[PDB]
């Protein structure tokens, strides 16, 4: 879905690179680890910069794993992560990039929004929507919906996947609900509000059937009950919103289906507070009343979610891409400055060590 | 005095061997969830913790899944959420992960504390990092989570003296000629009663010795 | 003698004979034996009623105040004695135990009424 200019790797290919044989750097780090000493972030940077084959991808994965489990794990630089993803894309190794991203705890791969978009768009161009969905779920887990381009791409992929899905496991419901709620909150349009409603409906179903811990545990979600109430609040907000904002009929149908299905371990809640299973009938009545109110106000959209998201993508992704490319160029310049400072520090330390050794 | 040099030699060797064979957090604070015992020492955890140990997460079990180990993020605790209605949390400023951990789920952390809505001036080390009691505040919820309106905290400024001590104070006053009728009072405004679950000084806390 | 850490505490040292207890209120290092070395004797406590039906407690209030002002701790029985004397507030557990005994006697009275 992204332009060739956004996906172009020429400027990254033109980065100033100091050439090494990957075997030499690997042996140096092996000696360092054997001596139980810390490895510099510059060394791992040089190894990742000097991947020249698909087997060097396999070796660099192992050395990333070893660096993550070392005293200087925190110092893995952003340009190194970007280069790792670029190399994986270059040598037809998207599966390895996805593997490291999924096991980010073991490898320390925490991409920026540009790098997420690169990976997700590669998967989308190859029509591998399953892996694109995996990348979207990783973006959700990392809470990286701060850039509009990522939000739009994630919404597109999510609605594409939901358009052809019937069987829902509660983990799948939880992941889909979170991944649609987070970008839906940052988009103040009809698509964003419909995504908010759909995700709140899914999370409320998960909460009522499996419990609130199933919702918030190891998720970027809050531990407060009342997700269905928040969906109804989204409907209420749309009712008092300007003319242009609307709600897709599909999201309303999903919420209605969830309520119709719901109305047919440690206790974390105070016994004086009313449970959700007891407020289901009132939620249903509120849903029917608000649905009639929205239908009267003409705040219901008949277009499907996927088509509406496609149209929004076509309208906004170009300007989002322009902004992202500008920020990416700024980042590359700053990274070059930082890398040259690191190289100078190493050279100065080595020369001072030689000066001392000469005595 | 005949010198005792073997004692000094043994003390120095023991100090060196303790500083070189230090047990790591991944070893000290590992837990067998089936039996709820520490494999390092074999001691069983207290009963009141068992459920939490099987449901909640350690702090770096959360921080290892975040960029920069979650610097600047807000982390709260389940016990604080249950006990207190006002927001209690840490704003992280520095993290030292235990690289020897297989999942990088052990380590140390520093941050700025807000307890019951009162933020501290400086950042200090976080205690109970190894407890299974930690939750991560979502970015889109922070504004709602952090919101707090300071209620008027007007408490007693003075209390009566105990009966016999009051009687003795008054008797001494009348002995020294004073005839004023004001009741003796104990000022209690400078005695601030700190909640028992307020975070303590982790820098002053000890560490389990290797064995 | 040098103890590792420790502090001064005002407590009750037990003397007397079998089935005839008597207490000396003393300020001593907490690590010392109960009836062993002490820093100062601050009073006495006879828990057996005398011929006048009285439990006699002697308290050196000046020296007790001095040692509290020098950093000495208090054992729970000593805090309860000082609360009974009116020198301290009544300890929370005297109040709680009194309430518990009131409830128990109320239950007994209710049992008698039910019978």
């Amino acid at each position: 879905l992204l332009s060739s200019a956004y996906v172009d790797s020429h400027k990254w290919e033109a980065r100033e690179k100091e050439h090494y044989c990957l075997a030499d750097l690997a042996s140096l780090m092996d000696k360092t680890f054997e001596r139980k000493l810390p490895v510099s972030s510059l060394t791992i940077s040089r190894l990742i910069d000097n991947i020249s084959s698909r087997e060097e991808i396999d070796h660099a994965e192992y050395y990333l794993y070893k660096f993550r489990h070392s005293p200087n794990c925190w110092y893995l630089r952003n340009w190194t992560i970007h280069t790792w993803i670029r190399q994986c894309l270059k040598y037809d190794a998207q599966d390895k990039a996805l593997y490291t991203l999924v096991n980010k705890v073991q490898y320390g791969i925490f991409p920026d929004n540009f790098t997420f978009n690169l990976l997700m768009d590669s998967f989308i161009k190859k029509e591998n929507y399953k892996d694109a969905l995996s990348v979207v779920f990783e973006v959700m887990m990392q809470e990286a919906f701060e850039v509009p381009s990522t939000q739009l791409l994630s919404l597109y992929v999510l609605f594409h996947c939901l358009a052809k899905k019937t069987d829902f496991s509660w983990e799948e419901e939880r992941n889909f609900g979170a991944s649609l709620l987070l970008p839906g909150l940052k988009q103040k349009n009809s698509v964003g509000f419909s995504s908010q409603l759909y995700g709140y409906a899914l999370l409320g179903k998960v909460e009522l059937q499996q419990g609130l811990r199933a919702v918030y545990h190891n998720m970027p979600l809050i531990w407060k009950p009342g997700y269905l109430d928040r969906a109804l609040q989204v409907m209420e907000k749309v009712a008092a919103s300007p003319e242009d904002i609307k709600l897709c009929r599909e999201a309303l149908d999903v919420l209605g289906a969830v309520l119709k299905a719901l109305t047919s371990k440690l206790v974390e809640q105070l016994d004086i507070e009313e449970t959700e299973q007891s407020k289901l009938p009132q939620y249903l009545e509120r849903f029917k009343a608000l649905h009639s109110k929205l239908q009267a106000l003409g705040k219901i959209e008949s277009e499907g979610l996927l088509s509406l998201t496609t149209q929004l993508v076509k309208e906004k992704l170009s300007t989002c891409e322009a902004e992202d490319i500008a920020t990416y160029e700024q980042n590359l310049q700053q990274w070059h400055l930082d890398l040259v400072q690191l190289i100078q520090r190493e050279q100065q330390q080595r020369e001072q060590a030689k000066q001392e050794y000469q005595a | 005095v005949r010198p005792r040099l073997i004692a000094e030699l043994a003390r120095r060797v023991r100090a060196l061997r303790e500083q070189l064979n230090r047990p790591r957090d991944s070893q000290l604070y590992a837990v067998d969830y089936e039996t709820l015992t520490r494999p390092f020492s074999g001691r069983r955890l207290p009963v009141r913790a068992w459920a939490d140990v099987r449901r909640e997460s350690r702090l770096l079990q959360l921080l290892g899944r975040l960029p920069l180990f979650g610097l600047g993020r807000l982390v709260t605790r389940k016990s604080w959420l249950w006990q207190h209605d006002e927001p209690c949390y840490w704003r992280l400023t520095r993290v030292r992960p235990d690289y020897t951990a297989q999942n990088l789920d052990h380590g140390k952390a520093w941050g700025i504390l807000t307890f019951k809505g009162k933020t501290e001036s400086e950042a200090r080390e976080i205690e109970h990092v190894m407890y299974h009691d930690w939750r991560l505040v979502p970015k889109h919820e922070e504004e709602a989570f952090t919101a707090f309106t300071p209620a008027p905290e007007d408490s007693l400024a003075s209390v009566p003296y105990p009966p016999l001590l009051r009687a003795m104070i008054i008797a001494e006053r009348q002995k020294n000629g004073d005839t004023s009728t004001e009741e003796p009072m104990l000022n209690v405004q400078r005695i601030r009663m700190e909640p028992w679950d307020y975070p303590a000084k982790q820098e002053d806390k000890g560490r389990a010795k290797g064995t | 003698k040098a103890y590792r850490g420790g502090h001064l505490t005002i407590r009750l040292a037990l003397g007397g004979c079998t089935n005839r207890p008597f207490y000396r209120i003393v300020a001593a290092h907490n690590k010392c034996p109960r009836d062993g070395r002490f820093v100062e004797q601050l009073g006495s406590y006879d828990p057996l009623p005398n011929s006048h039906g009285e439990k006699l407690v002697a308290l050196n209030l000046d020296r007790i105040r001095h040692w509290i002002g020098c950093g000495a701790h208090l054992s729970k029985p000593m805090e309860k004695l000082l609360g009974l004397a009116g020198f301290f507030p009544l300890h929370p557990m005297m109040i709680t135990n009194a309430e518990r005994l009131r409830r128990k006697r109320a239950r007994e009275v209710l049992l008698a009424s039910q019978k």
Binding site: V267, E268, D271, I272 | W82, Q83 | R102, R105, A106, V109
Partner: peptide, 30 residues
């Protein structure tokens, strides 16, 4: 105590609770 605090304690000590005690008798029962 307020009912909210009693419920908070009832949550804190699930499964390890005694019968709640009311106000004690005003005087010592005879």
């Amino acid at each position: 105590p307020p009912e909210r605090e009693l419920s908070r304690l009832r949550r804190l000590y699930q499964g390890h609770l005694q019968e709640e005690s009311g106000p004690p008798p005003e005087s010592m029962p005879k």
